[PDB]
């Protein structure tokens, strides 16, 4: 049994925030870890060690990583029948290529991976792959790929889906037009939801913290609201396992007058460019990568595409993420 914490989530958030310039950031560390853990089953030597370093899995064996992911995925799918949860994995590879059975069977066994041999040159393949993504995200992420390169060898794709209903919903009749001050200091008018209810609450030097439950209270949203003059950049930079543990343990049921905007965001990342290299994953993205667990062919990771969606409203939250690890032949 491995006691894996949320270090990867905080490191991925911090590194993504450092490199992207957009006002909004929205990621699924779970989706990224699951797709890269499928891929890691084929890696040897420094390729494998650099992937474990980036994933914050150094010192864990592949057997323990696989068994942890398998147990985690099954627990998330059954902990709350009143919340919709989707966890789907698929492997798509070039028809006619030989892919090793221990690698495929490790992924079928521990990730319930759907495995398909496809002709990447067919006009039908992009709709088949993108159609799978739409099917596993309630059509909220309808494309993960815009093109397939000529040297494509394999896609390892994960889709995470979430649709929760607030334990205490907002009344649509209580939503009002109100200002929201943007990251650049300018103001926009938004649909500000409001309610007075019992919520989990705590504070520290920087911020106020709120916990809003969904369904049977297995899942919740944590909101970190910096005090006046404080920034979200500082909150992100100072967020680690120690700090998160202190926030969670400090939460107490409190009567709160909540004001929250209706909001939606859709984000797209190429994690191979700067983020995963900074986290320690370098060699797997180069021609010196070694994936002998997958094939005898010389392959490497060309892109790690991460796309997300979130919509928050009076009823609850809908969120989705897709991560595609694109492997190409050198």
């Amino acid at each position: 049994k491995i006691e894996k914490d949320n270090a990867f989530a905080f490191d991925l958030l911090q590194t993504t925030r450092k490199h992207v310039t957009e006002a909004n950031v929205f990621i699924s560390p779970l989706s990224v870890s699951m797709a890269l853990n499928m891929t890691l089953n084929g890696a040897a030597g420094v390729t494998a060690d650099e992937m474990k370093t980036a994933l914050r899995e150094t010192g864990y064996t592949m057997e323990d990583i696989n068994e942890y992911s398998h147990s985690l995925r099954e627990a998330l799918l059954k902990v709350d029948p009143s919340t919709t949860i989707g966890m789907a994995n698929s492997i798509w590879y070039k028809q006619g290529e030989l892919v090793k059975e221990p690698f495929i069977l490790a992924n079928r066994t521990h990730y319930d991976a759907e495995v398909k041999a496809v002709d990447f040159s067919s006009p039908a393949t992009l709709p088949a792959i993108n159609g799978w993504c739409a099917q596993k995200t309630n059509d909220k992420i309808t494309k993960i790929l815009d093109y397939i390169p000529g040297n494509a060898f394999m896609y390892l794709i994960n889709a995470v889906y979430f649709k929760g209903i607030w334990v205490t919903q907002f009344k649509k009749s209580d939503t009002k037009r109100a200002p929201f001050r943007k990251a650049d200091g300018t103001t926009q008018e938004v649909n500000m939801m409001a309610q007075k209810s019992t919520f989990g609450y705590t504070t520290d030097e920087c911020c106020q913290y709120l916990e809003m439950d969904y369904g049977n209270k297995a899942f919740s949203m944590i909101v970190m609201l910096p005090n006046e003059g404080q920034t979200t950049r500082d909150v992100i930079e100072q967020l680690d396992n120690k700090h998160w543990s202190m926030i969670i343990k400090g939460i107490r049921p409190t009567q709160v007058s909540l004001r929250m905007p209706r909001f939606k965001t859709e984000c797209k990342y190429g994690l191979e460019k700067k983020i995963l290299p900074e986290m320690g994953m370098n060699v797997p993205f180069t021609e010196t990568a070694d994936f002998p667990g997958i094939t005898d062919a010389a392959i490497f990771i060309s892109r790690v595409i991460h796309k997300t969606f979130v919509q928050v409203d009076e009823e609850g939250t809908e969120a989705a993420a897709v991560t595609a690890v694109e492997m190409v032949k050198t």
Binding site: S28, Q188, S220
Partner: protein, 33 residues
Amino acid sequence: PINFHINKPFVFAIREKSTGVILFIGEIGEVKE
């Protein structure tokens, strides 16, 4: 009651309690619909 008025940028996360896993995490600097 305590006021928790989200009228400026914030960080948020969707978590599951028994596993403690963060499924999603982000920051909102601009509201979109």
